[PDB]
């Protein structure tokens, strides 16, 4: 189906406690496959998925060199941000960047992304056209003008249309037996009395991949979004995911409730009920 590759950088300043930290992670769809932490003793880009370990030394050594340099770049970027925002060196600050490419089912590039944030808010972003920028404030407009004149967008466009799409197709092949395999959810409903007149119906979905999923509760066929506790989709620790949705129901009305599960690994939407038997 559709696939994507994303890189997430985090650069954190910690004045009076140590040098700024740089953490970077790589994902294919919802599977982490590489990582780098400047706080490690021997900072190295390391593998986090089995299918990537087959790459040779030039790959690991080149990624390590790039990240060591990237860390120094975001060290400078953190100082430059203090200037733009007129902030002291006493505060801790964070810069984030996430960028990557989206393949369509046809395997040709569908969209590229490159966005950056400062202290949790938008800073600057590459627009869809991969040629122009969107700046969130006056400080980012300084960065924009520099990147416009330095023709940065063009170097990024070239990476997103080229190496990013190519490596993503390369990765997708090396680990197709897990990455291009969808794992449907194993589902069921549980019953938990709250009192002698109320019970919680919980709809479970376990061990699915990818993470995208839709759980809803219906009563007599009517959605109950307003009364549904939906937890955030969570990692199981083995690269599959879990989610549940619960509704508080009055004793006796249980069988009027239905759970509907949508997941791309499913032949059809499922419709579940509590099966007390």
């Amino acid at each position: 189906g559709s696939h994507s590759m994303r890189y997430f950088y985090t650069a954190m300043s910690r004045p009076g406690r140590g040098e700024p930290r740089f953490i970077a992670v790589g994902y294919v769809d919802d599977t982490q496959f590489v990582r780098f932490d400047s706080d490690a003793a021997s900072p190295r880009t390391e593998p986090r998925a089995p299918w990537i370990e087959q790459e040779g030394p030039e790959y690991w050594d080149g990624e390590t060199r790039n990240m060591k340099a990237s860390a120094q770049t975001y060290r400078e970027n953190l100082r430059i941000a203090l200037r733009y925002y007129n902030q002291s060196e006493a505060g801790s600050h964070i810069i984030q960047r996430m960028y990557g490419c989206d393949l369509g089912p046809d395997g040709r590039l569908l969209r590229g992304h490159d966005q950056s944030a400062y202290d949790g808010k938008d800073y600057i972003a590459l627009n869809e056209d991969l040629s122009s920028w969107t700046a969130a404030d006056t400080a980012a407009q300084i960065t924009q003008r520099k990147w416009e004149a330095a023709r940065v967008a063009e170097q990024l466009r070239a990476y997103l249309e080229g190496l990013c799409v190519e490596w993503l197709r390369r990765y997708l092949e090396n680990g197709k037996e897990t990455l291009q395999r969808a794992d449907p959810p194993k589902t069921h409903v549980t019953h938990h009395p709250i009192s002698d007149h109320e019970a919680t119906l919980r709809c479970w979905a376990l061990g699915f991949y990818p993470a995208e999923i839709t759980l809803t509760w219906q009563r007599d066929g009517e959605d109950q979004t307003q009364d549904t506790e939906l937890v955030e989709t969570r990692p199981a620790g083995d690269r599959t995911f879990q989610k549940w949705a619960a509704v508080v129901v009055p004793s006796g009305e249980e069988q009027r409730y239905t759970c509907h599960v949508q997941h791309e690994g499913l032949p059809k939407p499922l419709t579940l009920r509590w099966e007390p038997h």
Binding site: T10, V25, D37, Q96, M98, G120
Partner: peptide, 9 residues
């Protein structure tokens, strides 16, 4: 896990 973040930062 390794520090990561969501679409909303």
């Amino acid at each position: 896990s390794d520090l990561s973040f969501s679409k909303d930062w």
